[PDB]
Structure formats: C-alpha cells, structure tokens
C-alpha cells in the first residue's frame, strides 16, 4: 500500500521452497477453482501479448515460460489470480496482438504455425477462472454493520461493534463506545450476530437501547435493524437444530477439566476448566495457567465443537509440551497428579469433536499468517508441526514464543501471494 510490502520472489526461486497449495485453505479466494489448475497449462500473458506455460505453482504464484525460448533465462513469476493473464483464445476473441518477445523475433517471419503447433490439444485456465476468483473475493459483510464481538479488554463478554474497514474478507471491528477494536477474518469464531449474547447466555456490553432491544426480543419477538449483522453472515460449525430439535449434543458439565489453546497466548496449550455451560454448545472455559483472579472476568467462550479444545493428556500423547496449571511445574506436572490434587474430573475423549479433515498441510510448507497478537499484521510463516488436525505455525525469523497453534481450517492462514492479491501489507522476516 502506501508503505510497501514484502515480496516472496527472492524465496520463490529456490528448490527447497515448499508452499501450501491454495487448495489447503477453504476460506482462501479461488480455493475451489484452484485444484482445476495444472502444472502444464498454456496461457496468454504480457498492449500486446504472447503465450506462456505454467511450469510451477507455489501458492498463488505461477512460474511462467514464454513459447519458443530455449532456456529458463526469461522465465518469470506471476500472481496467477491477478496478473495480466488470460486463457488461450482471449486475444483472438478481442482482436489483441500476439507479438513474439524481442529476444526470439528472429526465429520466424510468421508465427501462426509455431503457436498453433504449441497450442493444439493443450490445457488452459479453468472455464470461468477469474469470475470464480472475484466472487470469492467479496465479503459477506459490508461497511456499517453492527455485530457482537469479543471484548479484547474483557474476554468473558462480547461488546457491540461496527464493521468499519474491509480488506480481503478481513474486517475491522470498532466497538460502540470507543475508537478501539480489532481485525479478524469474516469466518472467525469470535464475532457474532446481533442477539447472539442474549440467545446463548453469554455476557453482553452494549448501549441501553440495544440492551432493551435484545431483552424485548426474548420476552416477545426479535426486532431486526437494517444494520444488524445477522446469523446468515456468520460461519458456524453446527446448527441450532441439533440442540432444540434432536437430542442436545451437550456433554461438558461445569467443573470438568480439559486442555485448550490459550486465547491470550496462541503458543500455549493449557489445562482448562468448564466454568459455565451456556446454550447451544457454547461454554465458558477458564485457562488454569492464569493467576487465580479471572473470577468471571478472564473466562473464555469456546463452542463444544471447537478444534482448539482437547482431552486431558492430548499434549502428552502428541509430544506437545503443555503449559502447566498455575503454581505447577513443567518438569513435574502430571494430569494424574493434578486431578488428585484438585479432586476434579477430566472430560472423556468421547465429548470432543474428532474429525481429521484432509487438509494437505505438511511440515515445512510456506504460507501467510495473521498475527493474532496484532491482527493488522499478516506475516511470512511456516508449518512447524502438523498434529492430526492441528498446526503449529512459526513466523520465519521470529522466536518460538510468537508461534501459533492454529486449526488447519483457521481463517487466519493464507496461501503465499494472498497479501498481494487482496492488497494487504505483508510482513517478511525481521531484520
């Protein structure tokens, strides 16, 4: 933007740079259409054009090679989903000139034969390639919508907020009483529709008129406003049917111990406690590594189906190092010791959601990752660990304390090239 950005290019051109395919990111624009692309397709590139072959696809980046070049000398990388690239036949339909690049002019007086020879029975870009890209490029939200958003100052409560900015499906949410707020993706589990808090039984901070509106929607009927962000705009991993129609999938009871990603420190998985069971599978969790203080205040809401909660012992079995409970010791800490101390009970494996999606991520893969500690930053990152469904992502050239445990389907992770597509500043390794 106004300040510049990091470019992947110096890294792109080495045979050790492995990038997560766009296919890995269900929220990424062009995710579906992308696996129709192939590492051999021909394409029209460059007021005049030429055909080139895609030799290599890394994230959104494609290695182009012009026709009639003996060597890789003039191979060039493009952002496939936003370069001046078209499917073979584009020029002919529009009357645009196909002129050989200066370096190879001499090869022929006339070029139709050569090209026809190269283009016959050759693949190009999927049917409606760029339309599909542009459709997914749009936000479900629009500027000026009010929603209920986790209060960054009091994580045990949501606070009325407003969509103020949108850059590539990432929203800025400004709180009602404030010029403070945060960035988060459209799909993130910490933003909610108006009425959510009083539906679920979660704590709410909002204006008087709004507090009255929600109360007068639960004693009687929901009054919907023109600027309400409503349920249809939000991603949910379940439906309300499951709770009111079929027998409730509810299983956690208050007091059950478990393990959870620390919402205040994504590099940490800790013992936690179910502190209040809300409606529709939502529950208030307390991370036990905190100083005994969170009395209502620092409790956090995870839905029972969240891929950030795990049975006790999860770290142990998976060779993840656990953050021990407050007053305990990493060399010493044992669940069986902790439970006998606290006289508490641990939630059984059967209570947790255990589906391992076919995510395709693997150790060493490069990707772009939002910094949840500062979500205006999207940064160069690597898949440091893949534990079934769960990823440890490391920010290249930062320490390990900045690492983030994220779900493989997190909306905070993006294919290399996302930033330039969406037009967002990209942070490279620090120097």
């Amino acid at each position: 933007g106004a300040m510049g950005s990091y470019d992947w290019l110096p890294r792109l051109s080495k045979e050790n740079f492995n990038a997560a395919p766009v296919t890995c990111f269900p929220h990424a624009p062009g995710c579906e259409v992308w696996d129709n692309l192939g590492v051999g397709m021909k394409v029209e590139v460059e007021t005049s054009f030429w055909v080139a072959t895609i030799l290599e696809i890394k994230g959104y980046k494609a290695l182009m090679s012009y026709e009639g070049f003996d060597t890789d000398s003039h191979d060039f990388w493009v952002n496939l989903c936003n370069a001046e690239v078209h499917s073979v036949g584009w020029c002919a339909t529009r009357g645009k000139p196909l002129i050989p690049p200066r370096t190879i002019e001499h090869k022929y007086k006339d070029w139709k034969d050569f090209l026809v020879g190269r283009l016959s029975g050759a693949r190009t870009l999927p049917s409606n390639f760029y339309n599909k890209i542009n459709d997914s490029l749009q936000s479900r939200f629009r500027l000026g919508l009010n929603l209920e958003c986790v209060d960054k100052d009091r994580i045990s409560q949501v606070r009325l907020a407003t969509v103020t900015k949108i850059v590539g499906d990432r929203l800025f949410l400004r709180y009602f009483d404030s010029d403070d707020g945060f960035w988060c993706h459209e799909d993130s589990p910490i933003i909610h529709p108006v009425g959510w808090a009083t539906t679920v039984g979660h704590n709410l901070a909002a204006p008087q008129d709004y507090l009255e509106r929600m109360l007068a929607g639960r004693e009687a009927m929901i009054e919907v406003h023109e600027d309400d962000a409503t349920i249809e705009l939000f991603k949910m991993n379940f439906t309300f049917d499951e709770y009111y129609s079929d027998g409730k999938t509810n299983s956690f009871v208050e007091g059950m111990k478990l393990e959870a990603v620390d919402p205040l420190n994504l590099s940490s998985i800790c013992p936690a406690t179910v502190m209040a069971v809300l409606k529709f599978g939502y529950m208030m969790i307390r991370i036990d590594s905190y100083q005994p203080d969170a009395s209502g205040s620092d409790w956090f809401c995870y839905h029972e189906k969240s891929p950030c909660i795990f049975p006790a012992g999860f770290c142990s079995v998976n060779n993840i190092s656990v953050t021990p409970p407050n007053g305990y010791d990493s060399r010493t800490f044992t669940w069986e010791g902790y439970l006998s101390d606290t006289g508490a009970v641990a939630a059984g494996q059967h209570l947790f959601h255990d589906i391992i999606p076919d995510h395709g991520f693997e150790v060493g893969m490069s990707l772009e990752c939002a910094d949840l500690m500062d979500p205006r930053l999207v940064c160069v990152a690597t898949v440091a660990r893949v534990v079934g469904r769960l990823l440890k992502v490391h920010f290249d050239g930062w320490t390990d304390e900045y690492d983030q445990w994220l779900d493989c389907e997190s909306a905070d992770i993006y294919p290399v090239g996302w930033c330039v597509l969406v037009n967002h500043k990209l942070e490279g390794p620090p120097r």
């Binding site: 910094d371 500690m373 500062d374 930053l377």
Partner: peptide
C-alpha cells in the same frame, strides 16, 4: 506494542 513498525 511488542512488534515495532516495519
């Protein structure tokens, strides 16, 4: 802040 502007 912990991350300085870059």
């Amino acid at each position: 802040h912990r991350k300085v502007l870059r």
